[PDB]
Amino acid sequence: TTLPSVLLIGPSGAGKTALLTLFERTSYKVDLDAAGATARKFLLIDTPGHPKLRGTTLQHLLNPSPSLTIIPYKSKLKAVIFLLDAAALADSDGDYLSQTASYLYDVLLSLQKRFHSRKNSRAPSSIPVLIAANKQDLFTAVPASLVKSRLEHELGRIRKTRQKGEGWLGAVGSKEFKFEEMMEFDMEVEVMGGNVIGDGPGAERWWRWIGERI
Numbered sequence: 216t217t218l219p220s221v222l223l224i225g226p227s228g229a230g231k232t233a234l235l236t237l238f239e240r241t242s243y244k245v246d247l248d249a250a251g252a253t254a255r256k257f258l259l260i261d262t263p264g265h266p267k268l269r270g271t272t273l274q275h276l277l278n279p280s281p282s283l284t285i286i287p288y289k290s291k292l293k294a295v296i297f298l299l300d301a302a303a304l305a306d307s308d309g310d311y312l313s314q315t316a317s318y319l320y321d322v323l324l325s326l327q328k329r330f331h332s333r334k335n336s337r338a339p340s341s342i343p344v345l346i347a348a349n350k351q352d353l354f355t356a357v358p359a360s361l362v363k364s365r366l367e368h369e370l371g372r373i374r375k376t377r378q379k380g381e382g383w384l385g386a387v388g389s390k391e392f393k394f395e396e397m398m399e400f401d402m403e404v405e406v407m408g409g410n411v412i413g414d415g416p417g418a419e420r421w422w423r424w425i426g427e428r429i
């Protein structure tokens with residue numbers, strides 16, 4: 216067994232490869248020898264963003280006690296970073312918002328189903344989720360507080376449309392979706408801005424948030 220794992224999840228173009236590169240400077244090929252993994256005491260596990268390949272990642276999130284197979288060999292999953300392009304989110308057609316929120320919906324619903332799976336009465340270990348709103352260096356980037364409200368409204372729209380036509384994300388009696396409501400399933404979900412390149416807040420706040428929780 217190695218250091219614990221953090222799954223890095225998100226649509227293509229979000230900056231996952233770039234983030235992993237910054238961090239360093241089925242089964243997963245991971246450089247254990249990387250200075251970033253030794254100094255922070257966790258492994259950052261890049262996953263594919265292509266829609267056809269998301270099922271594999273979601274399967275880890277359903278498991279009451281997920282361990283990742285790591286090829287430099289079992290690592291405990293302790294957190295998720297969901298990375299998105301905060302600039303692409305600002306597009307007028309709303310396409311990126313919709314497709315990104317759809318993925319996030321599945322990620323959170325998977326962790327919710329995990330919480331609810333009780334082959335024995337005991338609650339599973341917590342897996343917090345950092346929604347990392349990347350590319351804040353760009354002038355067109357949506358700020359984290361707006362990323363939060365836009366995502367919440369879209370996740371709300373999805374659950375309402377699906378119920379009209381478990382599939383329901385969040386609390387049964389919730390009338391307006393909020394990430395905070397996921398604490399009913401001991402799921403801490405927070406939206407935080409940052410950037411991997413360019414001038415801005417950088418990535419350290421993301422690393423701190425994860426570090427305090429694993």
Ligand SMILES: Nc1nc2c(ncn2[C@@H]2O[C@H](COP(=O)(O)OP(=O)(O)O)[C@@H](O)[C@H]2O)c(=O)[nH]1
Nearest residue numbers: 227228229230231232233349350352410411412
């Ligand atoms: N402006 C800006 N561009 C970024 C940032 N992070 C990544 N990128 C760029 O976004 C593109 C997609 O990044 P990549 O790591 O390949 O994304 P991936 O598909 O999620 O693995 C690349 O051109 C990166 O250089 C950022 O914080 N700001």
